[PDB]
Amino acid sequence: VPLASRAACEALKDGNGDMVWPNAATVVEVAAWRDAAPATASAAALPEHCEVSGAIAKRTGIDGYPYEIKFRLRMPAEWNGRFFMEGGSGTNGSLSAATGSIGGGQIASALSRNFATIATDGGHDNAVNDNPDALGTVAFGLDPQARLDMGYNSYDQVTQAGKAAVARFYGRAADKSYFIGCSEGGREGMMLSQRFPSHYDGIVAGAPGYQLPKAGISGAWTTQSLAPAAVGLDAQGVPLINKSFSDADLHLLSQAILGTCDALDGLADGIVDNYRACQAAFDPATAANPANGQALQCVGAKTADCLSPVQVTAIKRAMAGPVNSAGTPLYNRWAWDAGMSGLSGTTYNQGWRSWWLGSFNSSANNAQRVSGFSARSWLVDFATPPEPMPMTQVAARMMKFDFDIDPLKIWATSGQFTQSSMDWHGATSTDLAAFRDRGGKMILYHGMSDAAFSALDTADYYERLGAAMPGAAGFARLFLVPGMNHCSGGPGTDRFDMLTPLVAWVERGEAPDQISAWSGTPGYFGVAARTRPLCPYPQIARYKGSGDINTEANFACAAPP
Ligand SMILES: [Ca+2]
């Protein structure tokens, strides 16, 4: 059977065929030859390739549901010798097209660049592991092994199955392996560098949820912090956290942040490049509304041009981060940034507020962290033992969350839950020497206006890494994105090709001194286009003093003033 052919492809199915899978419980459902597909308005052309899909470790969980680790692999006929895995998102449970997303709002897929590409659902399936008594598609959390699969094991099993298929199909191993993930996918990339250092040579970890079990602790905190500013009750009698601030209120706050913080980088441009000086300077309880030259905080009754003392107290407490009775921090604080709002044409940015507040225009709580996926995930996936409950109870549970008792549950084991959610899901280790010392390179990125995971918390991980590993910028660099929301969106340069510079760093030792980025919504600044350099932490973009402020070539990376 010739290598890299339709016959080699279809032979991967038989199971009586020659093919030897590292995991004996690997079942191939599909091995099909796929014709080249043209470019579309939204996707780069795909080459001719072999598509393999199936499942590892089919079983029944202790909840009585089916579990397996699905994968989908695409091996181009004409291969550049590179292997590529994409990361997940949310609580996973779906199996993408597996053409290899590189994020950063890119048109090009890794498969369109002649990589072999793989993806997984992470060990459960949203169509089948949907349990109306354990909050829907988070129900995989009732099964101890489904937790370990979600945390680390699925990515490991699928990486090995993929490299074995590559070696059989092409008759050689990949020259280099690359992983790109954002959010849950960025947690996965950091987990790979820590737990499986030789799985990937290059890793991009965007907005990484490396402490994801603490997300719901932040959520209980932001929920209780904002409840005083809430107006009205939902059907269960929970305050409408979504009514704490209107879109106009959040735009006023972002304008005040720009009034204090915009020019701290040397240029007034609707972007806070000097995020550190901003956190030192801005306090909404003393700052000016620069529209009217008066205090942001209302002196009399609430108007459109001010925030009430209760709103200011609420947002300051939410942003400060959760503490227990002892005043011990349980997560981290969040950065004040312009991307908490923004206006493009007639449209207010929803990309910050959807996490802690939800939609203003609603009679129900719909924030991720109040009643949505993130609050549900905490209760069933990260709390040990799990706390399944009707969906109508979730917001009340966040309101009565106890910061001395509930936070212990991400460190506990219980009955058949023999690892804590910090053990299986967390990726807090700074022991990266095995990764670095085999030639591994890691690009981290994070939007400053991310309300899922704190940019400042990624920066603190990076600080702890630099302290544990002198010269860390030789193998790992962090790119903070002023104005960007969770993975994409918001008034910043949220679009970039991370794969090109990753390949250059891994294969040529060329470290990214900067990464070109451009705004997906340049409407936020009223321009056609804005391109800026992303800078390796702790550097920021500095205007050179002349030229179009919308052109990258007029900016350099430097220490803050
Ligand atoms: Ca600026």
Side-chain angles (χ1 to χ4, degrees):
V1 170
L3 290 185
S5 71
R6 183 178 170 198
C9 172
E10 293 179 358
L12 291 174
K13 199 181 201 310
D14 322 320
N16 254 224
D18 275 358
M19 174 64 188
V20 184
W21 295 102
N23 192 314
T26 300
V27 176
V28 169
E29 299 288 352
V30 176
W33 199 251
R34 300 305 193 199
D35 298 333
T40 62
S42 60
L46 300 177
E48 189 180 33
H49 66 277
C50 164
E51 174 185 357
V52 183
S53 71
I56 302 170
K58 204 206 143 139
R59 67 195 169 78
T60 305
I62 69 170
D63 54 359
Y65 284 75
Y67 294 95
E68 63 186 32
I69 298 157
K70 298 191 199 313
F71 65 96
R72 174 174 281 122
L73 164 68
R74 291 176 190 275
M75 292 182 287
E78 299 173 21
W79 179 46
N80 62 13
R82 300 181 181 88
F83 181 73
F84 186 96
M85 180 167 184
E86 52 176 72
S89 57
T91 57
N92 283 341
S94 53
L95 184 64
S96 76
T99 64
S101 319
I102 68 164
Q106 296 303 294
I107 291 129
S109 70
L111 181 63
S112 82
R113 297 195 181 166
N114 300 99
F115 288 74
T117 62
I118 199 157
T120 185
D121 63 0
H124 64 273
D125 174 353
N126 293 326
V128 166
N129 299 117
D130 187 10
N131 176 349
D133 302 333
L135 299 170
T137 58
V138 298
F140 69 94
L142 304 191
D143 180 67
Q145 183 63 50
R147 289 178 166 212
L148 308 191
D149 294 343
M150 178 61 189
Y152 60 91
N153 181 62
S154 64
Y155 320 96
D156 176 27
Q157 294 300 319
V158 161
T159 299
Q160 288 183 53
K163 291 180 181 195
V166 160
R168 169 53 70 93
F169 189 68
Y170 292 113
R172 57 183 170 117
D175 300 317
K176 296 292 169 183
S177 298
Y178 298 91
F179 179 101
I180 304 194
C182 194
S183 186
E184 157 56 22
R187 179 199 72 75
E188 290 156 19
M190 283 183 64
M191 177 277 297
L192 288 160
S193 69
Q194 297 170 27
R195 186 179 285 255
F196 304 113
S198 73
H199 280 201
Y200 294 96
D201 301 306
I203 298 170
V204 168
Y210 78 102
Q211 303 207 78
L212 233 159
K214 294 182 187 183
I217 309 179
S218 182
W221 185 256
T222 60
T223 295
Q224 291 175 20
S225 285
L226 289 160
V231 173
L233 298 194
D234 70 19
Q236 286 77 219
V238 180
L240 290 170
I241 304 303
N242 53 316
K243 296 293 186 197
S244 47
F245 292 72
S246 62
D247 296 348
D249 291 344
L250 288 187
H251 191 230
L252 195 58
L253 177 60
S254 56
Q255 290 295 105
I257 292 163
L258 285 175
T260 313
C261 286
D262 192 344
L264 298 180
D265 51 45
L267 178 60
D269 60 356
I271 295 178
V272 184
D273 270 283
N274 200 352
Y275 59 85
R276 276 318 170 186
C278 183
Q279 305 320 301
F282 178 80
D283 174 2
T286 58
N289 170 343
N292 63 8
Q294 286 159 247
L296 171 67
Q297 184 167 82
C298 293
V299 169
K302 175 80 169 87
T303 78
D305 311 330
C306 64
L307 303 174
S308 71
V310 169
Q311 285 176 315
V312 171
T313 295
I315 190 54
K316 288 161 64 74
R317 192 173 186 271
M319 294 289 285
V323 295
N324 63 13
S325 298
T328 309
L330 302 173
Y331 178 57
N332 213 319
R333 85 301 191 180
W334 306 78
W336 303 105
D337 191 36
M340 297 176 75
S341 195
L343 184 64
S344 190
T346 249
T347 312
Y348 281 121
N349 184 13
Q350 305 302 297
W352 181 89
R353 65 169 295 140
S354 53
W355 291 92
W356 309 352
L357 280 70
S359 315
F360 188 87
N361 267 272
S362 171
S363 44
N365 275 304
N366 80 344
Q368 279 274 6
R369 286 286 155 71
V370 174
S371 64
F373 298 116
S374 173
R376 290 183 211 153
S377 184
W378 192 84
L379 287 169
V380 176
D381 302 333
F382 302 142
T384 311
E387 301 185 20
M389 75 181 55
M391 309 231 200
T392 56
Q393 288 188 212
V394 170
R397 182 68 177 83
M398 289 305 107
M399 280 301 295
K400 44 202 166 57
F401 195 103
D402 178 330
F403 295 94
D404 291 333
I405 306 309
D406 282 321
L408 301 184
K409 290 179 183 173
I410 72 166
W411 308 98
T413 60
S414 194
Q416 303 198 269
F417 302 91
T418 56
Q419 298 193 29
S420 68
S421 63
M422 285 298 298
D423 290 335
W424 53 260
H425 221 39
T428 64
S429 172
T430 53
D431 181 13
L432 264 41
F435 179 74
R436 173 198 69 199
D437 291 339
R438 63 181 304 283
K441 305 299 181 184
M442 187 166 62
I443 297 174
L444 296 128
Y445 72 87
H446 208 139
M448 296 301 312
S449 296
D450 188 334
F453 311 125
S454 173
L456 293 182
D457 194 50
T458 296
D460 281 342
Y461 174 82
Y462 188 71
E463 292 275 17
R464 291 196 299 278
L465 180 68
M469 303 183 60
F475 85 92
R477 281 175 189 205
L478 166 63
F479 299 84
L480 296 175
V481 194
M484 184 174 100
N485 297 129
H486 186 45
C487 287
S488 69
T493 63
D494 60 325
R495 289 195 182 171
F496 34 69
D497 171 5
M498 284 300 172
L499 185 54
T500 302
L502 189 61
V503 169
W505 198 6
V506 168
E507 304 181 5
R508 299 311 202 250
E510 180 157 279
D513 287 334
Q514 45 147 86
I515 294 174
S516 300
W518 69 89
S519 179
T521 315
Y524 280 127
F525 315 112
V527 297
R530 178 168 282 187
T531 71
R532 292 295 176 82
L534 302 186
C535 302
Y537 180 101
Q539 300 182 335
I540 67 164
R542 171 157 72 177
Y543 182 57
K544 275 152 146 161
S546 65
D548 193 334
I549 67 170
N550 300 294
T551 301
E552 184 189 346
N554 300 327
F555 293 76
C557 290

